[PDB]
């Protein structure tokens, strides 16, 4: 399947699995994209989600690579990183 | 519409957008609830008065937002309806000329 | 955006979902779980 | 309504001694209580406003209490400090009083 | 053109009357609040002054006009789909390396 | 400074009526509650009622409901109390007062009106 | 049509008749806005997500209802709703937008573009169609010989 | 990125040249800046307008002030005739684009037509300032 389900692995257990992430800044510049790549420089696809039964799993999909930038279909692989800030300051 | 002149564009510029429609005045002023403050707070102390005045203040702000939404709904129902009528009629005119 | 900094995640297609991990390991997966919930102080703020 | 029970009914004091006048409220009134002194043939005089606040040039030996238990301290009773002491509440509209009689031994 | 004309009508004809009604309302509210706070028994004049200044309403408390929200009203999903189906792109070649 | 002056008729027959007055000066007459206190000779204080002259807000105690009638004239800075159906129990000294920080308290005192029924 | 615009002239003869169709919804002359009191209380204090609590797995695990214990009177007599569409017939001397719109349609195989609405609606042919395509008519004129 | 606290020593002063201080009735002018306003937590911030950027001199000039979900631009002539424009953002919302986020504010002032306030490059509000007379701004701009 083109949809590769992402997983959280032990750091000493990654081995030769696909882990190299290329970051992208799209316009502030809040919109962030993450294209996954194996250790051979090939594209695994952008990191978004896909529906498997009830659960929408985090997935590297090359279908995003087939979509033009800024298209609505690219809003699934667009992410927002939120650090703890003293201006927001709710309980972590 | 505004075709009585030799140029519609300058007439629109002069007379504003409101001149495009036929029913200019349709707004009805909503009735308010007359403002009253409860009488049990006359003898309240300082600290225990302030934070309930806070609640009443937020109430008044919410009431203001509600009145604004009433005006917005009036605009959409009474005014923008005629402009969407104009949109559809102009599109039909475009289609007729294209057919010609 | 900085290295070595912890960031909670938001997905722009479904802002009301947050990233959660079902199980750790190759046999596990990570998915978007909702709702986020609401944090509030009355008459001041009520946010996700 | 609010009832102010004041104690003692009458008191005898040596000049130069500390005294306490107890004012008990049937309901909680925060600090909305006020102490007054009334001498012979004279109208009462405001001593300390609120639970504990100084007024003009009243002797600097008064003011104490909150809630339902209030006390009028007097650090050094002098000869002119004879008279009736009253406490009143300004929380509820009834606006009740009490009564105590400070005499000097 | 006609959407912008209608929004201009809201800004030029409806919003002013909303503003007039709102200041008519807030004048009454401010008068009532000031008189009530002066009626208060268990606070002094400084507290009355600061509390009146605390809970006054000015013209800024009801200036809700946001032209960008008005414009975004018509930014429906269907409009987005039409925009992306009718943009001038007739060919956009992409190429990448899958495993 | 603030001063309060009361007159009263000071002498009346049982069953008749009387109207005591209280003139205020030195402050804004319409910003302080003005209250009346009854004191029988040698007894303690007895609260009667309070008037706000800003908009004429009356509030009485239940014991002096039909006896006392409180009014105030905005233009003359005068607060009046009317005692009607006078009996022997009304012979007392009557004070009209208003506070200076807490409007409910009595800070500044009038000279009093001694009535005799 | 909800109403019909009859465009007359000075001599009061029908030059054209245009249709205006209604929405089909019921109408009320009561003017809701003028009588509505905006609530002060009880509404003082809406995410794009409503079906989150629908769990497809557990629902798919619920067995079908087999042994039905029917409730005898579970339905009403179905009453159809009928509607009589009324048509108004209103006259005017100043052309309406629908008048100008209808003037741009012709069933004639051979027609001619014109920028004169009165001439188009009063045509004695009647093969003239109202058009505001100024450049098109200009170019068609330039090559007429 | 500059952080200004509610302290007297947390301030930035700009002494302007005498040839660029505003004193006119007809000269249009604009301002722009990126501001990050933290969320309001206390009720004491309710109905508490506080200036952050100050260019007022004897009640004449311009100031940028803040309030509970309010960015306020204030113009005032020498006759104490003043006009205020506002951008309001609510704190009662699931996810906000303005609360504790960097916002690009732009205020344009046409002395003949209107004063307009834009947020993130989009027109937000406008008020007619054509009824304002002569405005004499400050010789310095105060950020505090
Ligand atoms: Mg999917």
Curated annotation (Swiss-Prot), chain C:
It comes from the Bacteria. This is Botulinum neurotoxin A heavy chain. It comes from Clostridium botulinum. It is a multi-pass membrane protein. Has 3 functional domains; the translocation domain (TD) and the receptor-binding domain (RBD) which is further subdivided into N- and C-terminal domains (N-RBD and C-RBD). Upon trypsin digestion the isolated TD forms channels in bilayers when the cis side is acidic/oxidizing and the trans side is pH 7.0/reducing. The RBD rotates 140 degrees around the TD in the presence of NTNHA. The 3 major domains each serve as a chaperone for the other 2 to ensure they act only in the correct host cell context. It is found in: Secreted; Host synapse, Host presynaptic cell membrane; Host cytoplasmic vesicle, Host secretory vesicle, Host synaptic vesicle membrane. A ganglioside GT1b (d18:1(4E)) binds at residue 13. Responsible for host epithelial cell transcytosis, host nerve cell targeting and translocation of botulinum neurotoxin A light chain (LC) into host cytosol. Composed of 3 subdomains; the translocation domain (TD), and N-terminus and C-terminus of the receptor-binding domain (RBD). The RBD is responsible for binding to host epithelial cells and transcytosis across them; this uses different receptors than those on nerve cells. RBD is also responsible for adherence of toxin to host nerve cell surface; HC alone prevents uptake of whole toxin by neural cells, and delays paralysis onset by 75%.
Swiss-Prot record, chain G:
The 133-Lys-|-Lys-134 bond is cleaved during long-term storage; the cleavage site is masked in the M-PTC complex. It comes from the Bacteria. Forms a highly interlocked heterodimer with botulinum neurotoxin type A at pH 6.0 but not at pH 7.5, called the minimally functional progenitor toxin complex (M-PTC) (BoNT/A, botA). Belongs to the botulism non-toxic nonhemagglutinin family. Assembles with botulinum neurotoxin type A (BoNT/A) and protects it against pH-mediated inactivation or protease activity at pH 2.6 (the pH of the animal gastrointestinal tract) but not at pH 6.0. Necessary for neurotoxicity. Has 3 domains that are structurally very similar to those in BoNT/A; light chain (nLC, equivalent to the light chain, residues 1-408), N-heavy chain (nHN, residues 409-829) and C-heavy chain (nHC, residues 830-1193). This is Non-toxic nonhemagglutinin type A. It comes from Clostridium botulinum. The lineage of its organism: Bacteria, Bacillati, Bacillota, Clostridia, Eubacteriales. The chain holds residues 399 to 548 of 1193 of the full protein.
UniProtKB/Swiss-Prot annotation, chain H:
Changing residue 70 to A/Q: Decreased binding of NTNHA by receptor-binding domain (RBD) at pH 7.5. It is found in: Secreted; Host synapse, Host presynaptic cell membrane; Host cytoplasmic vesicle, Host secretory vesicle, Host synaptic vesicle membrane. It is a multi-pass membrane protein. Changing residue 41 to G: Whole toxin has 50-fold reduction in toxicity, almost no binding of RBD to neurons. Residues 1-144 are annotated as: N-terminus of receptor binding domain (N-RBD). Responsible for host epithelial cell transcytosis, host nerve cell targeting and translocation of botulinum neurotoxin A light chain (LC) into host cytosol. Composed of 3 subdomains; the translocation domain (TD), and N-terminus and C-terminus of the receptor-binding domain (RBD). The RBD is responsible for binding to host epithelial cells and transcytosis across them; this uses different receptors than those on nerve cells. RBD is also responsible for adherence of toxin to host nerve cell surface; HC alone prevents uptake of whole toxin by neural cells, and delays paralysis onset by 75%. Has 3 functional domains; the translocation domain (TD) and the receptor-binding domain (RBD) which is further subdivided into N- and C-terminal domains (N-RBD and C-RBD). Upon trypsin digestion the isolated TD forms channels in bilayers when the cis side is acidic/oxidizing and the trans side is pH 7.0/reducing. The RBD rotates 140 degrees around the TD in the presence of NTNHA. The 3 major domains each serve as a chaperone for the other 2 to ensure they act only in the correct host cell context. This is Botulinum neurotoxin A heavy chain. The chain holds residues 913 to 1056 of 1296 of the full protein.
């Amino acid at each position: 399947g083109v949809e590769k389900i992402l997983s959280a692995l032990e750091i000493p257990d990654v081995g030769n699995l696909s882990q190299v992430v290329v970051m992208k800044s799209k316009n502030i510049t809040n919109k962030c994209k993450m294209n996954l790549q194996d250790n051979n420089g090939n594209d695994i696809g952008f990191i978004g989600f896909h529906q498997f039964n009830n659960i929408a799993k985090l997935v590297a999909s090359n279908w995003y690579n087939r979509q033009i930038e800024r298209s609505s279909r690219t809003l699934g692989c667009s992410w927002e990183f939120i650090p703890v800030d003293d201006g927001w300051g709710e309980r972590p | 519409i505004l075709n009585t002149s030799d140029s519609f564009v300058e007439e629109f510029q002069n007379l504003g957008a409101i001149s495009l429609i036929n029913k200019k005045e349709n707004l009805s002023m909503p009735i308010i609830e007359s403002y009253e403050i409860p009488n049990d707070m006359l003898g309240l102390p300082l600290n225990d008065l302030n934070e309930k005045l806070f609640n009443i203040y937020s109430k008044n702000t919410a009431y203001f937002k509600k009145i604004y939404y009433n005006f917005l709904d009036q605009w959409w129902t009474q005014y923008y309806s005629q402009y969407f009528d104009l949109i559809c009629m102009a599109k039909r005119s475009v289609l007729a000329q294209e057919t010609l | 955006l900085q290295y070595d900094k912890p960031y909670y995640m938001l997905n722009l297609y479904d802002p009301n979902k947050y990233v959660d991990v079902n199980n750790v390991g190759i046999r596990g997966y990570m998915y978007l779980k909702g709702p986020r919930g609401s944090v509030m102080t009355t008459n001041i703020y009520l946010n996700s | 309504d609010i009832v102010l029970t004041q104690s003692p009914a009458t008191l005898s004091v040596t000049p130069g001694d500390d005294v306490s006048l107890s004012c008990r409220a049937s309901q909680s009134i925060s600090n909305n209580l006020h102490w007054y002194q009334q001498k012979s043939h004279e109208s009462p005089r405001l001593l300390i406003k609120y639970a504990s606040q100084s007024i003009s040039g009243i002797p600097s030996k008064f003011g104490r209490g909150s809630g339902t238990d209030f006390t009028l301290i007097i650090n050094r009773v002098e000869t002119e400090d004879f008279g009736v002491y009253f406490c009143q509440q300004s929380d509820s509209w009834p606006y009740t009083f009490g009564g105590t009689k400070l005499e000097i031994i | 053109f006609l959407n912008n004309a209608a929004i201009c009508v809201f800004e030029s004809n409806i919003y002013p009357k909303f503003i007039s009604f709102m200041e008519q309302c807030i004048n009454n509210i401010n008068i009532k609040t000031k008189e009530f706070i002066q009626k208060c028994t268990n606070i002094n004049e400084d507290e009355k002054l600061q509390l009146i200044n605390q809970n006054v309403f000015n013209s800024l408390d009801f200036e809700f006009l946001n032209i960008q929200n008005m414009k975004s009203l018509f930014s429906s999903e269907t409009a987005l789909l039409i925009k992306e189906e009718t943009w001038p792109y007739e060919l956009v070649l992409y190429a990448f390396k899958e495993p | 400074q603030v001063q309060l002056q009361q007159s009263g008729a000071e002498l009346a027959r049982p069953g008749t009526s009387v109207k005591l007055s209280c003139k205020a000066s030195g402050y804004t007459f319409t910003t302080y509650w003005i209250q009346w206190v009854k004191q029988r000779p040698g007894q303690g204080l007895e609260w009667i009622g309070t008037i706000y002259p800003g908009d004429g807000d009356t509030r009485y105690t239940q014991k002096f409901k039909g006896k006392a009638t409180l009014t105030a004239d905005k233009s003359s800075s005068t607060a009046y109390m009317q005692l009607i159906s006078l009996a022997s129990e009304d012979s007392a000294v009557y004070y009209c007062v208003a506070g200076y920080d807490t409007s409910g308290t009595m800070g500044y005192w009038g000279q009093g009106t001694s009535v005799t029924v | 049509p909800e109403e019909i615009i009859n465009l007359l002239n000075g001599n009061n003869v029908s030059l054209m008749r245009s249709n205006i169709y209604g929405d089909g919804l019921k109408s009320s002359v009561d003017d809701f806005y003028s009588n509505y009191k905006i609530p002060y209380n009880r509404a003082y204090e809406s995410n794009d997500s409503s079906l989150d609590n629908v769990n497809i797995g557990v629902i798919d695990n619920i067995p079908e209802i087999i042994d039905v214990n029917p409730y005898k009177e579970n339905c009403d007599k179905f009453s159809p709703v009928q509607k009589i569409t009324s048509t108004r017939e209103i006259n005017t001397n100043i052309p309406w937008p629908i008048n100008y719109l209808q003037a741009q349609n012709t069933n004639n195989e051979k027609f001619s573009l014109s920028s004169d609405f009165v001439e188009v609606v009063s045509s004695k042919d009647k093969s003239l169609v109202y058009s505001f395509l100024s450049n098109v008519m200009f170019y068609l004129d330039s090559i007429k010989d | 990125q500059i952080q200004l606290f509610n302290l007297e020593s947390s301030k930035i002063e700009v002494i302007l040249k005498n040839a660029i201080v505003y004193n006119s009735m007809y000269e249009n002018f604009s301002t722009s800046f990126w501001i990050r306003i933290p969320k309001y937590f206390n009720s004491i911030s309710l109905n508490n307008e506080y200036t952050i950027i100050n260019c007022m001199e004897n009640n004449s000039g311009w100031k940028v002030s803040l309030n509970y979900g309010e960015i306020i631009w204030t113009l005032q002539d020498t006759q104490e005739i003043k006009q205020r424009v506002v951008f309001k953002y609510s704190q009662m919302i699931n996810i906000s684009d303005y609360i504790n986020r960097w916002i690009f504010v732009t205020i344009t002032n046409n002395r003949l037509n209107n004063s307009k306030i834009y947020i993130n490059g989009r027109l937000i509000d406008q008020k007619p300032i054509s009824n304002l007379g002569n405005i004499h701004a400050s010789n310095n701009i105060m950020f505090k």
